[PDB]
Structure formats: structure tokens, C-alpha cells
Design an enzyme around this catalytic site. Sequence first.
Site, PDB file in Angstrom:
ATOM      1  N   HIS A   1       0.835  -1.193   0.000  1.00 57.00           N
ATOM      2  CA  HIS A   1       0.000   0.000   0.000  1.00 57.00           C
ATOM      3  C   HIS A   1       0.875   1.251   0.000  1.00 57.00           C
ATOM      4  O   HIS A   1       1.721   1.408   0.890  1.00 57.00           O
ATOM      5  CB  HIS A   1      -0.918  -0.005   1.221  1.00 57.00           C
ATOM      6  N   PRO A   2       0.719   2.148  -0.975  1.00 59.16           N
ATOM      7  CA  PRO A   2       1.556   3.353  -1.014  1.00 59.16           C
ATOM      8  C   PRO A   2       1.359   4.222   0.218  1.00 59.16           C
ATOM      9  O   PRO A   2       0.249   4.354   0.737  1.00 59.16           O
ATOM     10  CB  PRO A   2       1.084   4.071  -2.283  1.00 59.16           C
TER      11      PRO A   2
ATOM     12  N   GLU B   1       1.105  11.338  -3.596  1.00 61.08           N
ATOM     13  CA  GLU B   1       2.000  10.999  -2.495  1.00 61.08           C
ATOM     14  C   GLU B   1       3.087  12.048  -2.326  1.00 61.08           C
ATOM     15  O   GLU B   1       3.457  12.390  -1.198  1.00 61.08           O
ATOM     16  CB  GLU B   1       2.614   9.618  -2.719  1.00 61.08           C
TER      17      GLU B   1
ATOM     18  N   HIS C   1       1.954  15.090  -0.258  1.00 63.05           N
ATOM     19  CA  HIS C   1       2.067  15.005   1.194  1.00 63.05           C
ATOM     20  C   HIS C   1       3.462  15.397   1.659  1.00 63.05           C
ATOM     21  O   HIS C   1       3.622  16.010   2.721  1.00 63.05           O
ATOM     22  CB  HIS C   1       1.731  13.592   1.668  1.00 63.05           C
TER      23      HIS C   1
ATOM     24  N   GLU D   1      -4.990  15.564   3.693  1.00 60.92           N
ATOM     25  CA  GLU D   1      -5.400  14.834   2.498  1.00 60.92           C
ATOM     26  C   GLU D   1      -5.948  15.767   1.427  1.00 60.92           C
ATOM     27  O   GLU D   1      -5.883  15.444   0.236  1.00 60.92           O
ATOM     28  CB  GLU D   1      -6.433  13.769   2.856  1.00 60.92           C
TER      29      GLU D   1
ATOM     30  N   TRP E   1     -32.041   3.703  12.256  1.00 60.68           N
ATOM     31  CA  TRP E   1     -30.903   3.657  11.343  1.00 60.68           C
ATOM     32  C   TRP E   1     -31.352   3.727   9.889  1.00 60.68           C
ATOM     33  O   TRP E   1     -30.872   4.565   9.119  1.00 60.68           O
ATOM     34  CB  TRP E   1     -30.086   2.391  11.589  1.00 60.68           C
TER      35      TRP E   1
ATOM     36  N   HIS F   1     -14.353   1.724   9.864  1.00 60.56           N
ATOM     37  CA  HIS F   1     -14.154   2.949  10.632  1.00 60.56           C
ATOM     38  C   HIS F   1     -15.044   2.990  11.869  1.00 60.56           C
ATOM     39  O   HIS F   1     -14.760   3.729  12.819  1.00 60.56           O
ATOM     40  CB  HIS F   1     -14.410   4.163   9.742  1.00 60.56           C
TER      41      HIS F   1
ATOM     42  N   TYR G   1     -13.690  12.659   6.413  1.00 57.69           N
ATOM     43  CA  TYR G   1     -13.917  12.374   5.004  1.00 57.69           C
ATOM     44  C   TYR G   1     -14.987  13.258   4.383  1.00 57.69           C
ATOM     45  O   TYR G   1     -15.185  13.199   3.166  1.00 57.69           O
ATOM     46  CB  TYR G   1     -14.294  10.902   4.815  1.00 57.69           C
TER      47      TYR G   1
HETATM   48 ZN   LIG Z   1      -3.670  12.409   0.413  1.00 61.29          ZN
END
Ligand SMILES: [Zn+2]
Lengths: 195, 595
Positions: free
Chosen positions: B326-327, B356, B359, B383, B458, B486, B496
Amino acid sequence: TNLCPFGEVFNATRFASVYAWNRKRISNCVADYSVLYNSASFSTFKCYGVSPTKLNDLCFTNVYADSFVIRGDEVRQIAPGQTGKIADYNYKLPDDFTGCVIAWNSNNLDSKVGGNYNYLYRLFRKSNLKPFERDISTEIYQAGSTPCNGVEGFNCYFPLQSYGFQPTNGVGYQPYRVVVLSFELLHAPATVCGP
Amino acid sequence: STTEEQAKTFLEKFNHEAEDLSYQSSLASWNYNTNITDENVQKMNEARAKWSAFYEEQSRMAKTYSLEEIQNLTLKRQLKALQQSGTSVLSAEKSKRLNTILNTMSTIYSTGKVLDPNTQECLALEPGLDDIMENSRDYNRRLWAWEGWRAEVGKQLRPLYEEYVVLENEMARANNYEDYGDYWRGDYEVTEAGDYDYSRDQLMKDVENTFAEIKPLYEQLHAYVRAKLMDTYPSYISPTGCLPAHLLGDMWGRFWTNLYSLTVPFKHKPSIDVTEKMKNQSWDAERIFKEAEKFFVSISLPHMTQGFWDNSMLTEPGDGRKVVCHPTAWDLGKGDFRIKMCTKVTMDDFLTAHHEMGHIQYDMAYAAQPYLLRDGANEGFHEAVGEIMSLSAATPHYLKALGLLEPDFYEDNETEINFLLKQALTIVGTLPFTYMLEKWRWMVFKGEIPKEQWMEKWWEMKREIVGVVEPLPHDETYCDPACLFHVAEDYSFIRYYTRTIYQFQFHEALCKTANHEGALFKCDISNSTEAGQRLLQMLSLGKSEPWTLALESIVGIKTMDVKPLLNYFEPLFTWLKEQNRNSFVGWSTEWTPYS
Ligand SMILES: [Zn+2]
Ligand SMILES: *[C@@H]1O[C@H](CO)[C@@H](O)[C@H](O)[C@H]1NC(C)=O
Ligand SMILES: *[C@@H]1O[C@H](CO)[C@@H](O)[C@H](O)[C@H]1NC(C)=O
Ligand SMILES: *[C@@H]1O[C@H](CO)[C@@H](O)[C@H](O)[C@H]1NC(C)=O
């Protein structure tokens, strides 16, 4: 043509820490600065109070050679009239300076994996250092009204931290060997002049 | 001599010591991800043990000082951040039980097994059950697979979740917070400067208000996907009813990216892709990273350090060393920056090379700040910064300057619309879901929803807000939220939602400074030094200033607004309205599938 071993300090196998800096007295010699200029190691050469060329044409009785190892971002603090962790607490240069400062990266020799814990400096001290002063004393620093009777703990910290050098650190945290030359003139027949 | 002055010396001891332990912990964790071996795992546990023990000693000692005596605002924030501990305030015998559940919840999710009707194999979640939810067009097959996850995990996870809510609520009570939900919103609170201060309660009535303008876009997008699903499934979807939950494309519907094949606008027109021509001229792994550097150089951002180009993982090793592929973008500290990614010659890896690396440029910017302030302004800034760089590289204008495609390619609105719908499914699809999920968990912690009415409320929200319905009836014994990574872990999901809004606020502002007139579609930030300096005054801020000040520094506003997002999708909005006028745009909450 007797010539003092500048290569003794510029090629020393082990340098000295910042809190305990070394001082060398040079006299009765000839100052050949071409070796320093033609050295492929040095990359920084700043002269304060004296011109870089015609260095040997004007000569003084006594020459002082000084040495220590500091961080890359921490070299710029070695300058007249500067405030910082080094200048205020470890090595204070005079406001009026007549000499040159030499510093070159030495990451290959001075940094090893697992850290190089042989280099230390002083982090806490009551009053700033007068120019050209060396403090080797190691007494538990007090930062509170209540004394702790000489044992470290709450509100009392050890006065020396430790440098941790590793080969993979950034270009600013890599070790830089610094040598400063302090020319001084007195009432002597110019013992060291040059070629 | 006073309390304020002696506090100043505390941080100097902490900062000059924490960095040495942080580097040891970060380097040890780097080696395991680079070399999976039993010996390496032991080092990380030992290294993290020293870091954990060191942190608790200072955090406990920091509580001794009095906050009011502190005057320097920068000093005040730094001391306060260390002072917050959290679960340590409870007793150990409460603490051991709380930790016991949290690790247990991960075990059931990790040990996922749903019994297949055939005895050939018992399919686990990774990766067999995921393949069913993505590459299967059978209604019955999707139904049993989707229900099977709730059938197995939901039943066991339900009893444990009841104790989970109560235990965490006690922790927040000792910290003077209203509930555990108030803690999760505590990261967005700044209290001091009257012009720039925020409120924990102000996070509510703000996420809802910005969701109001989104709904016109979502409802129009909602009905369009229904029409295309009619062709494949004629007698299973009502003309004005809600879509089944299992048919969204994923198990939980958090993304709609897998609906592109079914609901593509124009099948004839190919999508843009340079993979076939990337193999030409023999591009290698190091060219992608070296080229992607020029994007940041032209925007006047700093170059890459010499320690980056060596000792970094830029391709899969040939020595057989087991790795996690995973990067990731690592910031080990003390001046070392590395990238660990599975570099292949594809289009996606070209785009992720910019993400990437985005970041990393943020990590360099705040290197001057103290250790405690080496982070994004909030949990959503980091992000968002890297995502806007991915947008520019996707534009053909940047690609054309590289000669990767034809120098005189023909632009058509058909393929541009083809590109927007794919992006609309991902960016806009998760927005109703992310807000809904956090809205439920916020009310559960308050106690407004009784434990007996967890499941009834719900799906009521899902019908009204998300617009989906359960294919089969469920009762209180089920526990559907626990079927998410999560939620099973103690992770916050609000990051998010605000990330997407901040992502388009930055992109709109940097486009104006780039003197780009026209659509926001192909706005390129390349070869624009003016935009770069606008970015660097915000990135270098770090956590030193409140996020309101950091946000104002790039867009000139002191709040989050959804206007830039709508401006991005405006060209798709006009075209999509015409197609949706033939059918009903909306949903009927009364209609139910099982009846
Ligand atoms: Zn990011
Ligand atoms: C001093 O160090 C330099 C740097 O490599 C070297 O060229 C020179 O030979 C050394 N001097 C002696 C006397 O070894
Ligand atoms: C690139 O494409 C051209 C056109 O067919 C052809 O020479 C070959 O497929 C590729 N060339 C190289 C050197 O790979
Ligand atoms: C937009 O697309 C339609 C068909 O989808 C086409 O008739 C029209 O010419 C296009 N206009 C532009 C400006 O590309």
C-alpha cells in the site's frame, strides 16, 4: 621555511564537543593558506574583519585555532553579533571580530548507525557567555524557587543534552566540523607572517 | 521564576528529547513495512514501548502547571495539547475492559467468514466477498452475499456495542465533555480570538447547512443512475422508488465508483488513457517520480532532498523481501523524507505519484515549527492538499505538454462528460453517506435514540437522506454500522466530509491566481509561480495558527462553503438536468421492497 602543522587540526582524528571546545596557540611560523583554499573538503569560508585575499600580506603575532562539531542549520549561528542556542550558551564570538570561519560537512566520518553519542552541548544556563569563554562545569540546573539539593528531577534538569548523529538524517542535522581562526595583534615582532 | 517562565523551559526539555525517540520509533516502523521479518516486529514493539512510556510521564507531569498563568498564546496551545490524555483518567479495571472490547471488535472483523452454500470453500471478506460485490450482476447473488455479512458479524457485534457506548461516555464525562461525540468534534474547536474562534456545537448546524446546497446535485444525480439500472433490471426497481442497498456497487455503498460500467453515458467514445503510449519510449519507474518533481519546481516549490532519491522504496524489491505494498508517504523526522509505493507503469501510478509527493511538500513546509505543531491545521487539511495536485495531472493540458498523447488531440464534450460522471460517482457519492453516518453516531452518544430503537432509526435516516432501503427487513438484533472498518474501530468519520469541501475550496482559489478564464475543468496550475507562493504561506503555517486563519490565508473566508464544489460540477449539472427531466427526479420513502 618552518611551517606549523595546520594539518594537525584540520586532519584531527577526533574533534571536540561544543561545551568543551579546543583552543590552539600558533606562533613562530609561516601561514600558508593556499592549502585551505585548494582543499577539496571545505565548502564554507567566511572572513569577518579581514579581506579573504591579501591574507598573508598583513600578518599578526598570534593566531588561534579553534574546533568543534555542530549541526548544519546551526553553523550560521557562528557569526559576530548573533543570538541563538550556541552563541548565547555555548560559544559566543566577539562583536568585533578579525578572523575567518571554516566549516565543511563531515557526515561520512562523524555519523554512524545507532547514533553518535560522543558529542554534547549545554542547553540550560543562568547567564549568557561573555565572548571567548568556556564552561565545563556540570551542576544540576535549577528552574524553580525550591532547590532540589543537587539531584535531578522535578523542575531540575541536567545541563547537557546529547547529539544523536545518524547517516540518514537530513542535510541540516548532519555533523559539520567548524574551525574558526582568531587573529590578534600585540607588541611583538610579527612572529608569524607567511611566505 | 514565575509559573509562566518555568513552563517555557519544560517544552525545551520535551522538544529536544521527543525528536530522538520519535525518530527511533518511526525508523523501526519503516523497516517492518520495508522488510517483513519476525525479528523486525520485536524492535517496533520495544521502540513503541519507550515512546509510549515517555509520553505518559511528560503528559502527567504537564498537568501540574496552571493554564491561566500562561500568557503566551503559542505557549498556551503547546502546553494544552500535551495536557489532554483521555482514557488514562479512568481506573485501570475500567481501562482493561474498554481495551478488551476494542481489540475484540477487530478480531471478528478480521476473522470474517461467511459460509457458502457449497461445501467447496468458505468465502472470507478478503477478497472473495469483495469480488462478488463488484463484478456480479445477479440480484439474488448480491442479496445473499450482502445479508451474509450482517448475518454473521452483526449478530455477534451487537451485544458488544452496547457496553462500548456506555464505557466511552464515562470517559468523556471525566473530561467535562458532554459525551463521547463531543470529543470527536473537539479537534475543530478554537477558543480565544473572538474573530477567529469556533465552537464544538457550531460543528453541528454547519455540516447540515452546507449539505442543503448539495442535495440539488445529489437528487439530480440520484435519479440518473436509476434509469440506467432499469435497462439491466427491469422488474426490480420502482420507477420512483429507492434503489436496493446491495446494488449501490459496494457492500456499504460508501462509494459508487463501480457503477461506471453500467451507467456510462457514451459507450462508443473511449476514455483518456496514456498507458498504451507510456510503454512506448520505455518509461521506467524513476522517470515518473523525476518528472512529477518538475510539477512542483515550476510552481516554485522547493526541490527534493538528496536523501529522497536514494534509500527510498520506489519499486518492488527483487530480493523476495515481503513488504506491505500500500503506497504511503513517510515523514520520519529529523530531516528525512521517504516515499514507499508499488510503482508500476500505469496511468493510476502516474497520478498517485503526484498525490503521495504532495504530502511530502506539506511535511517540509512546517519543518521549522516545534514538534508538537508538525501537523495539518485540522484532520482534513493534509489529504485535501495532496488531492488538488492529482486534479491538475489528470487534465489533458498538463499531459499535452509532456507529449504523452497526440500533440493535436481533439477535445469533445462527450468524453469530458464521460470523465465527469466517473468523478461525480466518487466525490459526490460519499457525501450523503458520510454525513448520515456521523449524524447517527452523534445522536447515539447523546442518548436521544434508545438502545431498543437503534436499528429502526438507522434505516429511517437512510431512506430519508441517503435514499436507499434495506432489501430484507431487520430488527433490533442486527447491528449494521459495526460492519464498517471505521465504526468497528474507534475512528472518526467526519474527516472524510470536510476534506472534500476543503479540496475544492483550494482548487478554485488557486485557479483564479493562475489567470485561467473559462471552465474549472482543465485549469492548470503548472508554470504559475504566483499560485505557488499563495500555497506556501498556508502549508508552512502548520498547527501554529487556528485553522480559520489558515483557511482565510488561501481563500479569504473564515468558514467552509460548498459553492466551489458546485462550480466544479456545474458543466455536468446542465447536461444532466435535460436527461433527468423525462423521468421522476426524486425518491418515495413510503415504497418498500419486501412488500
Ligand atoms: Zn492524500
Ligand atoms: C589531510 O587531509 C587531506 C584530506 O583528504 C589529505 O589530502 C591530506 O593528505 C591529509 N594530510 C596528511 C598529512 O595526511
Ligand atoms: C513505439 O511505437 C512505434 C509505433 O508502432 C513502434 O516503433 C514501437 O511499437 C514502439 N517503439 C519502441 C522503441 O518501443
Ligand atoms: C456537445 O455534445 C452534443 C452531443 O452530446 C453535440 O451535439 C454538441 O455539438 C457538443 N457541443 C460542444 C460545444 O462540444
